């Protein structure tokens, strides 16, 4: 029943946190046990919502939730660990893509489709940072060459800017 | 010697009200001069 609010926005108060937990499910406790001096939330928070499937679909919905604009992570309570991906589908979404590829590692970057500014359709390319380099190994090995959404995937550890 | 155009001299109530105000500014001063974190004025003065 316990959920980790990471990326908890510096000013997104327990009001916003538990008002989002209540709008999704039986919000029985949200808590930002925080820095005992600065008072600001800890960047890590513990929220209990009584139902396990409630917490599950809550974590499914609260990925990339933009508290104070920054995506707030809700889950179970930067060395270059990114995978770049070719042959991507233009029908893809970033939340759905995190839901798909995230089982090998959580989304330490939201999956950005490298798409032009002129039209707004994908070029078959993307990039997203996983948790670990071992996570990049697993993700890109179970997603390398296999059949993605529309175009069979092609993903490897990140080429950096 | 005096001067013309003046009002009188304040009665006890005005003199005591001004004394209390002066005593308040005094204490705000010395509280600063000791850089006292721990003092506050509440909404009843």
């Amino acid at each position: 029943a316990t959920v980790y609010v990471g990326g908890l926005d510096e000013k997104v108060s327990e009001p916003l946190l538990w008002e989002l937990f209540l709008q999704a499910g039986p919000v029985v406790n949200t808590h930002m046990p925080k820095d005992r001096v600065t008072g600001q939330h800890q960047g890590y928070g513990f929220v209990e919502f009584l139902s396990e499937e409630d917490a599950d679909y809550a974590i499914k919905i609260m990925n990339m939730i933009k508290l104070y604009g920054k995506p707030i992570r809700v889950n179970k309570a930067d060395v270059g660990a990114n995978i770049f991906i070719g042959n991507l589908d233009p029908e893809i979404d970033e939340k759905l893509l995190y839901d798909t590829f995230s089982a090998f590692g959580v989304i330490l970057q939201t999956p950005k489709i490298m798409r032009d500014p002129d039209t707004g359709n994908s070029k078959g390319y993307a990039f997203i940072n996983f948790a670990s380099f071992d996570a990049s190994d697993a993700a890109i090995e179970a997603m390398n060459g296999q059949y993605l959404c529309n175009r069979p995937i092609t993903v490897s550890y990140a080429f950096k800017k | 010697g005096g001067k013309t155009g003046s009002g009188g001299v304040a009665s006890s109530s005005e003199s005591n009200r001004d004394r209390r105000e002066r005593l308040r500014q005094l204490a705000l001063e010395t509280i600063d001069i000791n850089k006292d974190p721990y003092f506050m004025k509440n909404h009843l003065g």
Partner: protein, 99 residues
């Protein structure tokens, strides 16, 4: 008499105004005159006055003096460094502890 509250308001006044403007300091207090504000500062509140216990040097002094100049406490006092009221009470004190 004087209360801790008057005393602290005096200390603060003096520390702002200085030790020759007793009349405005006396305006700051209620039921107090400049004569009395001055007397209090120079009897008790001044941080030059020391409130310790008597070194036995100080007490042999006190006894020798209070015999050489009998009853003259404002004259005895500065020669030993405490106010005349302290010298006098402590002198009677030694006298009765010795009696």
């Amino acid at each position: 008499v004087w209360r801790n509250t008057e005393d602290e308001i005096l200390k603060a006044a003096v520390m702002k105004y200085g030790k020759n403007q007793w009349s405005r300091i006396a305006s700051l207090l209620h039921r107090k005159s400049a004569k009395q504000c001055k007397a209090r500062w120079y009897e008790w509140l001044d941080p030059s006055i020391k409130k310790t216990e008597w070194s036995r040097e100080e007490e042999e002094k006190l006894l020798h003096l209070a015999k050489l100049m009998p009853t003259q406490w404002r004259t005895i006092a500065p020669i030993i460094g405490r106010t005349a009221a302290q010298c006098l009470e402590h002198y009677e004190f030694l006298l009765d502890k010795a009696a």
